[PDB]
Amino acid sequence: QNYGINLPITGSMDIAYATSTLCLYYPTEAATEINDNSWKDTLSQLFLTKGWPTGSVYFKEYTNIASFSVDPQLYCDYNVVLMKYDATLQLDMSELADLILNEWLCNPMDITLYYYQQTDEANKWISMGSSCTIKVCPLNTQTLGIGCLTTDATTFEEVATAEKLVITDVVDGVNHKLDVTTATCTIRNCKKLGPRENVAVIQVGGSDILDITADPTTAPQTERMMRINWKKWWQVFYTVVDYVDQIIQVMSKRSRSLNSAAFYYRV
């Protein structure tokens, strides 16, 4: 039933023992610079040398990091996302990287009726949409606002404005009233379960700026977060194709989920 997860495995310390799919997410800038009609066919042929049979490599194009952050989808067993560094979008890159690289379990969040609180450090509020504007008013034990009248939202403390993806972290154990713009945004109460080895992120350009932990005392640089200096998208793609072995070796496809959603939904 449970795959025997409760049972142990005994292995010895001496005994000698000795069609996956690959998605490549890239920005439209890359396609525009490549400026070839059959570059996907070319890269498919080249992957065939590294051993991925024809029909196993798929290429997904997204206009921007902002747009791609609106409910990103993970389609293949191995999902490699090429992220173009922009000095003005560091937090957006960090939020997208956190969402894709880490598994999340999210519950619905009806904000017009209920106060919400973060339980532990693993709980966040993830909001996605065309425009997510979030204003939070913390409450004391008496259900009165702290520095903000509950009735008037203009006194609420803004946390995000017209953002495609927001990972809000507020003080744990204190109720909040949120005036989130639900017309164009959907906000869910999520918990971070663990890493998702299915997906790797390759940042082109930049200076190694990605914090995938809400904790300020920790900015882990896992093995699936990579960075390369770039000046030609053909060079970037040739690098990825030539070193697909290393990237796959660093990844793991057992994290493939049944659905392409970046989070597990529970009602």
Partner: protein, 397 residues
């Protein structure tokens, strides 16, 4: 067996007591024993060998008695005695090897070689002398069905086994909890490891247990128990349980808390020691149960807080270990140990003469296999061959 031991003892006492110049009052009784040995062995034909590369040899005894008219031994007396003793010692050596190279599923303790079968007759009981050595003493005791006991220094009671058991794992092996252990000879080293350092555990305490059942009951054992397994405190790359891949282990050692060592006999706790290290005593047991916990330090300096996060990436893996060595013990059965050369002698004889693999012992007298399956027939055969090996060692240097 008793007659073979008596022959060996008489020959040893002759080679050491019969020396030129010694008073005849020092060797009168020994010479009476020697003369009776010669009289009893005279006129008997023996054949030894014929198995593997052990040559077939024939032995005939027609010897004269040692004299008894001298008040002091001189060169000639010792010379004649040595001439007789050399032949007797060669016969004893070949009888012992012939007996050691043989086994039997049924009646393992019974004599197997033709020479020892012949010696088991009643005419040879006249030469019995004194059975003083440990192994012959235990042989007679077990023949009468008394309580035997062999004293071992570091008994070789645990078969070699280096393994690990995982209680939490994933395909990526980047967050593991479990135990690793080496049991070898008389030493158990066990280390429980937790990658999360009990961040999410209930009470920040992760329990580890290790049960080592012994194949025989040890008694009055002195045991050294130290709080760290030096063998599992360095980085490792280890094959996965199935063997498909390899995982990384990067230990960082904490003290084990709530250490409980329980020595049990037939599932009944005979001895128990809590948070006790150094020399402890187990009077009677056949199972060892080590319980130890990894407790996340309640207070950490910055260099330790950096080590132990709450997020998944766990670079350093908390590890708590125990080492347990049986310095000396007493066993009713016979075991190889670090101070005796009986197993070495038996294996050496078999290897030297290329004895074909028999139906009882494993090939090459492999102690791992012997102890792993130490059946009663194997115990009987092993006790017989060890007794013969001790008898041989009395004479052959």
């Amino acid at each position: 067996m008793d007659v073979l031991y008596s022959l060996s003892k008489t020959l040893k006492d002759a080679r050491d007591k019969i020396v030129e110049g010694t008073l005849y009052s020092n060797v009168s009784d020994l010479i009476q024993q020697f003369n009776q040995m010669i009289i009893t062995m005279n006129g008997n034909e023996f054949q030894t060998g014929g198995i593997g590369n052990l040559p077939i040899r024939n032995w005939n005894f027609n010897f004269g008695l040692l004299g008894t008219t001298l008040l002091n031994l001189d060169a000639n007396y010792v010379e004649t005695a040595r001439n007789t003793i050399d032949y007797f010692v060669d016969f004893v050596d070949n009888v012992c090897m012939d007996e050691m190279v043989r086994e039997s599923q049924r009646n393992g303790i019974a004599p197997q070689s033709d020479s020892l079968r012949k010696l088991s007759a009643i005419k040879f009981k006249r030469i019995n002398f004194d059975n003083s050595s440990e192994y012959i003493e235990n042989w007679n005791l077990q023949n009468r069905r008394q309580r035997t006991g062999f004293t071992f220094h570091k008994p070789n009671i645990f078969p070699y086994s280096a393994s690990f058991t995982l209680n939490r794992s994933q395909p990526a092996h980047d967050n593991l909890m479990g135990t690793m252990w080496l049991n070898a000879g008389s030493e158990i080293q066990v280390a429980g490891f937790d990658y999360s350092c009990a961040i999410n555990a209930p009470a920040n305490i992760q329990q580890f247990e290790h049960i080592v059942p012994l194949r025989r009951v040890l008694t009055t054992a002195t045991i050294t128990l130290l709080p760290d397994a030096e063998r599992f405190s360095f980085p490792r790359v280890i094959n996965s349980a199935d063997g498909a891949t390899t995982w990384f282990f990067n230990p960082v050692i904490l003290r084990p808390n709530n250490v409980e060592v329980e020595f049990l006999l037939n599932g009944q706790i005979i001895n128990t020691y809590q948070a006790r290290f150094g020399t402890i005593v187990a009077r009677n047991f056949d199972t060892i149960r080590l319980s130890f916990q990894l407790m996340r330090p309640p207070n950490m300096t910055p260099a330790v807080a950096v080590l132990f996060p709450n997020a998944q990436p766990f670079e350093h893996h908390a590890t708590v270990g125990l080492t347990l060595r049986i310095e000396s013990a007493v066993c009713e059965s016979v075991l190889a140990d670090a101070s005796e050369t009986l197993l070495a002698n038996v294996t050496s004889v078999r290897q030297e003469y290329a004895i074909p693999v028999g139906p009882v012992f494993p090939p090459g007298m492999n102690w791992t296999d012997l102890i792993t399956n130490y059946s009663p027939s194997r115990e009987d055969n092993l006790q017989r061959v060890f007794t013969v090996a001790s008898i041989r060692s009395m004479l052959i240097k």
